[PDB]
Ligand binder design. Structure first.
Ligand SMILES: CC(C)NCc1ccc(N(C)C)cc1
Length: 165
């Protein structure tokens, strides 16, 4: 199962790891993607997860959008996990670089509560522009299920652990 994680709370764990490498190793039931409303997996975590699936995640996502239309900011959908996981939970955190409301970050993390255990990135962090320290705080105060957070950047991982209240 999950190894090498630091326990932050009763249900939140954290590790300095590449979420693609972590997914290929653990083969979790659920891997969370840092999705946008269009499921266009171009960059950041989404671009990396999609590249690992040889673009199969993008082909499946385009069919999902053609049928259902875009997701809401704060919303999610469950699609295949391809070669990375049983399922991928595509969760849309607000992208503050696109002017999306940061208050929707709690709604985005609420989607994790529908799954007993997840491998996930910090929502709205990285290219989504939010403060990752704030994202971790919203995560621990919102998610009640078991979440294993993979933080790619070592320097950010160290800052997140050393500043965790
Ligand atoms: C039971 C859990 C640890 N693994 C579920 C599971 C997830 C993904 C895959 N593959 C082959 C991508 C296989 C199995």
């Amino acid at each position: 199962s999950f190894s090498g994680y630091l326990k932050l709370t009763d249900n939140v764990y954290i590790k300095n790891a590449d979420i693609v490498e972590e997914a290929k190793k653990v083969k979790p039931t659920v891997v969370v993607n840092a999705a946008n409303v269009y499921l266009k997996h171009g960059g950041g975590v989404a671009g990396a997860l999609n590249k690992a699936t040889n673009n199969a995640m993008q082909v499946e996502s385009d069919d999902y959008i053609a049928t259902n239309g875009p997701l809401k900011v704060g919303g999610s959908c469950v699609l295949s996990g391809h070669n990375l996981a049983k399922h991928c939970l595509h969760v849309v955190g607000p992208n503050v670089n696109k002017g999306e409301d940061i208050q929707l970050l709690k709604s985005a993390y609420e989607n994790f509560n529908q799954h007993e255990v997840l491998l996930a990135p910090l929502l709205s962090a990285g290219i989504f522009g939010a403060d990752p320290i704030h994202s971790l705080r919203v995560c621990v105060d919102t998610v009640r299920t078991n979440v294993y957070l993979a933080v790619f950047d070592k320097n950010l991982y160290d800052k997140l652990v050393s500043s965790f209240l």
